[PDB]
């Protein structure tokens, strides 16, 4: 937006995990779907560092549920390649898309598979 | 007037000197406007079952021992002219040139039903050409030849010195089957033989120390001007552009120019190709390479030139352009600012790793300096390059490096230790032709211990 630095520190807090700073940023109108250069959205940096609470706030803040990085991987695909069962489930709650696939053509269940992670594998097995 | 179409012919000469006929014709009709906007966006494709031939000059060192810096240029040009005559006969595409090496591919833009046939026959022609040049010039050197087949993703990378090239495991396989090839005869594999039809003098050519054989025989002109002048400065630098602009060829002896290689080590382990063609991983590779290229645009980055990109490598040198020994400049600060470039490009790969999801791409870098020879090869084509001891010295050095650790030559270590940079001694490494050589590293206890 007009001087899109709000989203910048938004992303850097999403990677840092500073809850109160995210709260102040959104209270100041930080764009809930502002991304860095590589298509990474704050949901991505959140799923990376395991700040489930900030994930929660950001979904409360209305962030995109299927935002794709430059590599097409959604933060759904991120956590699926990671294994943060909590964030996986909470994203399933907020309407994650199940039959999609990144520009690698793979569904995030196969990501959990290549992790050797039976947890998220079974977790996505139960959906449709 | 028609000087515009003259310049267009010049730009055609340039493009067909960086890209083969098919893609050059595809882009000279300017298919998509974004591609030309870039030439002032590209496409990369992965083709299966192609034939890749490498050939290195055996014993280049002494054949280049005591020359006047000119004769080697001319003889190498003769060799490569014969070689490309051979290619255009066999309809196989030359690709690039690494010092003592030269190499081609078969059927990558359009696959041909008997590509490896043409490839090995091209190899036989190479053998005949080298033996005839040997008995002609009275220069006792021949060439080792290693051939392979498989599947490769080809395209372009970088925006500076970008050159149409190829990447896959097949690259490494052909490169080693050259490095494990025999002097004068072609080192093949079943990947070649599995559609060979035993029409030759085959031998079970293996190592004496995986299904490996040997064969021994049997008013817009200013728009056009910026475009074409930029392509020129792309493929060759400025000073050489002038020195040949008023002449036919070029050759120069720089007794002191540092060279550094930087190779992405952990790339292959990430290459995993369960995706269709792996081309996106290499797109990310191009992002990183282009960042490396953009580095050059710094003003204090003037005396540094990117020689070329070897496969996934990144070859950068200095001390060649500014011939003027300035009284207001120390003649040895070029290597200081080169090593500073190295540290800062380490910083840049670090930054790229901040954004690389759940993966680190680390790089090993090797340093060297000393005498070397710069030249320009092509004619009706073009290729800038350098040779000497320093080049393959640095190559064999960085070939034995560990990532994030600046492997430096012992004498360069000496000359730089008095420039303030702190080093830890790695050991003494065996070098071909030089034996044991002491190596050093810049990072001071970067690990746990």
Chain B residue nearest residue A40, CA to CA: B355
Nearest to A51 by CA among A15, A92, A12: A15
| CATH code assigned at B83 | 3.30.70.1230
**The total number of structural domains that make up chain A:** 1
On whether residue B409 sits in a domain, the answer given is: yes
Contact flag B357-A36 (C-beta cutoff 8 Å): no
Method: cryo-EM
Contact flag B358-A82 (C-beta cutoff 8 Å): yes
B193, B215, B237 — which closes off a domain? B215
On whether residue B236 sits in a domain, the answer given is: no
On whether residue B370 sits in a domain, the answer given is: yes
Q: What are phi and psi of B199, to 5 degrees?
A: -95, 25
| Distance of alpha carbon A12 from alpha carbon A46, whole angstroms | 10
User: Which pair of tokens denotes residue A101?
Assistant: 């696939």
Residues of B in contact with A106 (CB under 8 A): 274-275
User: Which pair of tokens denotes residue B234?
Assistant: 């792309």
**The total number of structural domains that make up chain B:** 2
Q: What are phi and psi of B141, to 5 degrees?
A: -145, 145
Nearest to B28 by CA among B253, B250, B228, B210: B228
Chains A–B, number of C-beta pairs less than 8 Å apart: 25
Chain B residue nearest residue A11, CA to CA: B355
Tell me which residues of chain B have a C-beta less than 8 Å from any C-beta of chain A.
274-276, 280, 284, 355, 357-358
Residues of A in contact with B274 (CB under 8 A): 106
The answer to whether the annotation marks B47 as part of a ligand binding site is: no
Strand partners, B374: B252, B386
| Distance of alpha carbon B285 from alpha carbon B268, whole angstroms | 12
Contact flag A48-B280 (C-beta cutoff 8 Å): no
Domain encompassing residue B163: 44-215
User: Same structural domain for residues B159 and B110?
Assistant: yes
Contact flag A40-B280 (C-beta cutoff 8 Å): no
Cβ-count burial B401-433 (b if 16+ within 10 Å, e if not): beebbbbbbeebbebbeeeebebeebeebebee
Contact flag A48-B358 (C-beta cutoff 8 Å): yes
Q: Closest to B355 (Cβ–Cβ): which among A38, A82, A106?
A: A38
Name every residue whose Cβ is closer than 8 Å to that of residue B282 and which is 6 or more positions away in sequence. B44, B153, B155, B157, B167
On whether residue B30 sits in a domain, the answer given is: no
Q: Are A44 and A50 in contact (CB under 8 A)?
A: no
User: Same structural domain for residues B206 and B59?
Assistant: yes
Resolution (A): 4.2
B109 C-beta neighbours (distance < 10 Å), count: 18
User: Same structural domain for residues B286 and B399?
Assistant: yes
User: Same structural domain for residues B198 and B253?
Assistant: no
Q: Is B35 exposed, middle or buried (0-12, 13-18, 19+ CB in 10 A)?
A: middle
Chain B residue nearest residue A74, CA to CA: B357
Name every residue whose Cβ is closer than 8 Å to that of residue B285 and which is 6 or more positions away in sequence. B157, B264, B267, B312
User: Which pair of tokens denotes residue B152?
Assistant: 């490769």
Say if A68 is an interface residue toward chain B (CB within 8 Å): no
Strands B406-408, B363-368: pairing is: parallel
| Distance of alpha carbon B162 from alpha carbon B367, whole angstroms | 23
| Distance of alpha carbon B234 from alpha carbon B111, whole angstroms | 29
Chain B residue nearest residue A101, CA to CA: B275
Name every residue whose Cβ is closer than 8 Å to that of residue A35 and which is 6 or more positions away in sequence. A7, A11, A41, A67
Q: Are B139 and B63 in contact (CB under 8 A)?
A: yes
- Chain A residues 31-50 with CB within 8 Å of chain B: 36-38, 40, 44, 48
Q: What are phi and psi of B85, to 5 degrees?
A: -55, -50
Nearest to B10 by CA among B329, B227, B208: B227
| Distance of alpha carbon B384 from alpha carbon B307, whole angstroms | 8
- Three-class DSSP labels, chain B: CCHHHHHHHHHHHHHCCCCCHHHHHHHHCCCCHHHHHHHCCCCCEEEEEEEEEEEEECCHHHHCCCCCCCHHHHHHHHHHHHHHHHHHHHCCEEEECCCCEEEEEECCCCCCCCHHHHHHHHHHHHHHHHHHHHHHHCCCCCEEEEEEEEEEEEECCCCCCCCCEEECHHHHHHHHHHHCCEECEEEEEHHHHCCCCCCCCEECCCCCCCCEEEECCCCCHHHHHHHHHHHHHHHCCHHHHHHHHCCCCCEEEECCCCEEEEEECCHHHHCCCCCCCCHHHHHHHHHHHHHHHHHCCCCCCCCEEEEECCCCCCEEEECCCCCCCCCCCCCCHHHHHHHHHHHHHHHHHHHHHHHCCCCCCCEEEEEECCCEEEEECCCCCCCEEEECHHHHHHHHHHCCCCCCCEEECHHHHHHHHCCCCCCEEEEEEEECCCEEEEEEECCCCCCCC
Contact flag A69-B274 (C-beta cutoff 8 Å): no
Say if A29 is an interface residue toward chain B (CB within 8 Å): no
Q: Closest to B358 (Cβ–Cβ): which among A81, A105, A106?
A: A81
B215, B236, B259 — which closes off a domain? B215
B21 C-beta neighbours (distance < 10 Å), count: 11
Nearest to B177 by CA among B166, B190, B167, B187: B187
Handedness of CA B28, B33, B39, B44 (dihedral sign): negative
Chain B residue nearest residue A44, CA to CA: B357
Residues of A in contact with B280 (CB under 8 A): 71, 103-104
From B416's Cα to the closest Cα of chain A, the distance in A is 37
B107 C-beta neighbours (distance < 10 Å), count: 21
Q: Closest to A78 (Cβ–Cβ): which among B274, B275, B357?
A: B357
On whether residue B317 sits in a domain, the answer given is: yes
Q: Is B358 left (phi over 0), alpha (psi -120 to 50) or beta?
A: left
Cα–Cα separations (whole angstroms), residue B87 to B92, B123, B125: 5, 10, 9
| Distance of alpha carbon B113 from alpha carbon B355, whole angstroms | 43
Say if A127 is an interface residue toward chain B (CB within 8 Å): no
Q: Are B406 and B441 in contact (CB under 8 A)?
A: yes
| Distance of alpha carbon B109 from alpha carbon B111, whole angstroms | 7
From A35's Cα to the closest Cα of chain B, the distance in A is 12
- Three-class DSSP labels, chain A: CCCCCHHHHHHHHHHHCCHHHHHHHHHCCCCCCCCCCCCCCHHHHHHHHCCHHHHHHHHHCCCCCCCCCCCCCCHHHHHHHHCCHHHHHHHHHCCCCCCCCCCCCCCHHHHHHHCCCHHHHHHHHCCC
Cβ-count burial B311-327 (b if 16+ within 10 Å, e if not): bbbbbbbbbbbeeeeee
User: Same structural domain for residues B113 and B197?
Assistant: yes
Q: Are B105 and B50 in contact (CB under 8 A)?
A: yes
Radius of gyration of chain A (CA): 14
Domain encompassing residue A57: 1-128
From B231's Cα to the closest Cα of chain A, the distance in A is 28
Cβ-count burial B165-197 (b if 16+ within 10 Å, e if not): bbbbebbebbbebbeebeeebbbbbebbbeebe
Residues of A in contact with B355 (CB under 8 A): 36-38, 40
The answer to whether the annotation marks B100 as part of a ligand binding site is: yes
Strands B304-308, B406-408: pairing is: unpaired
């Amino acid at each position: 937006h007009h001087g899109s630095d709000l989203g910048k520190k938004l992303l850097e807090a999403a990677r840092a995990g500073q809850d109160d700073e995210v709260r102040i940023l959104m209270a100041n109108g930080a764009d809930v779907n502002a991304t860095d250069d590589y298509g990474h959205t704050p949901l991505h940096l959140a799923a990376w560092f395991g700040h489930l609470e900030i994930v929660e706030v950001l979904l409360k803040a209305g962030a995109d549920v299927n935002a794709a990085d430059w590599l097409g991987d959604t933060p759904l695909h991120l956590a699926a390649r990671i294994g943060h069962l909590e964030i996986v489930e909470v994203l399933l709650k907020h309407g994650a898309d199940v039959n999609a696939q990144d520009k690698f053509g793979k569904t995030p269940f196969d990501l959990a598979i290549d992790n050797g992670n039976e947890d998220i594998a079974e977790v996505l097995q139960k959906a449709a | 007037g028609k000087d515009l179409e003259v310049e267009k012919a010049l730009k055609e000469r340039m493009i067909h000197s960086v890209m083969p006929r098919i893609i050059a014709d595809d882009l000279m009709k300017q298919g998509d406007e974004e591609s030309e906007n870039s030439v002032k966006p590209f496409k990369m494709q992965q083709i299966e079952e192609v034939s890749i031939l490498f050939a290195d000059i055996v014993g280049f060192t002494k054949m280049s021992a005591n020359k006047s810096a000119h004769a080697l240029v001319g003889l190498l040009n003769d060799l490569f002219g014969r070689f490309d005559r051979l290619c255009e006969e066999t309809k196989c595409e030359k690709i690039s040139t690494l010092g003592d090496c030269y190499y081609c591919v078969a059927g990558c833009p359009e696959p041909r039903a008997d590509h490896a046939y043409c490839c090995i026959e091209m190899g036989l022609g190479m053998i005949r050409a080298i033996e005839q040049f040997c008995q002609e010039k009275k220069e006792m050197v021949n060439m080792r030849v290693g051939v392979h087949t498989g599947t490769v993703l080809c395209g372009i990378l970088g925006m500076r010195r970008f050159k149409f090239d190829v990447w896959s495991n097949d690259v490494n396989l052909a490169n080693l089957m050259e490095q494990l090839g025999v002097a004068g005869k072609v080192h093949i594999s079943e990947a070649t033989a599995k559609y060979l039809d035993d029409r030759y003098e085959m031998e079970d050519g293996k190592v004496t120390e995986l299904k490996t054989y040997l064969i021994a025989g049997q008013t817009k002109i200013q728009s056009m001007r910026d475009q074409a002048d930029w392509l020129l400065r792309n493929i060759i630098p400025y000073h050489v552009a002038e020195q040949l602009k008023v002449s036919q060829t070029y050759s120069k002896n720089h007794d002191s120019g540092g060279v550094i290689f930087a190779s992405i080590v952990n790339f292959s382990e990430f290459y995993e190709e369960n995706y269709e063609g792996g081309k996106e991983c290499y797109r990310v590779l191009n992002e990183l390479i282009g960042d490396f290229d953009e580095l050059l645009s710094k003003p204090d980055y003037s005396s540094i030139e990117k020689i070329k990109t070897i496969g996934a490598t990144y070859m950068a040198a200095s001390g060649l352009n500014a011939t003027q020994c300035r009284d207001g400049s120390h003649p040895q600060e070029h290597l200081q600012i080169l090593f500073e470039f190295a540290k800062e490009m380490m910083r840049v790969v670090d930054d790229f790793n901040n954004n690389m999801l759940w993966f680190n791409f680390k790089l090993r870098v090797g340093f060297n300096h000393g005498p070397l020879t710069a030249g320009v090869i092509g004619t009706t084509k073009l290729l800038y390059d350098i040779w000497g001891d320093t080049v393959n010295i640095a190559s064999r050095m960085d070939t034995t490096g560990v990532e994030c650790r600046i492997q430096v030559s012992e004498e360069s270590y000496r000359v730089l230790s008095k420039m303030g940079y702190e080093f830890d001694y790695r050991g003494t490494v065996n070098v071909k032709g030089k034996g044991q050589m002491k190596t050093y590293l810049y990072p001071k206890c970067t690990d746990s211990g």
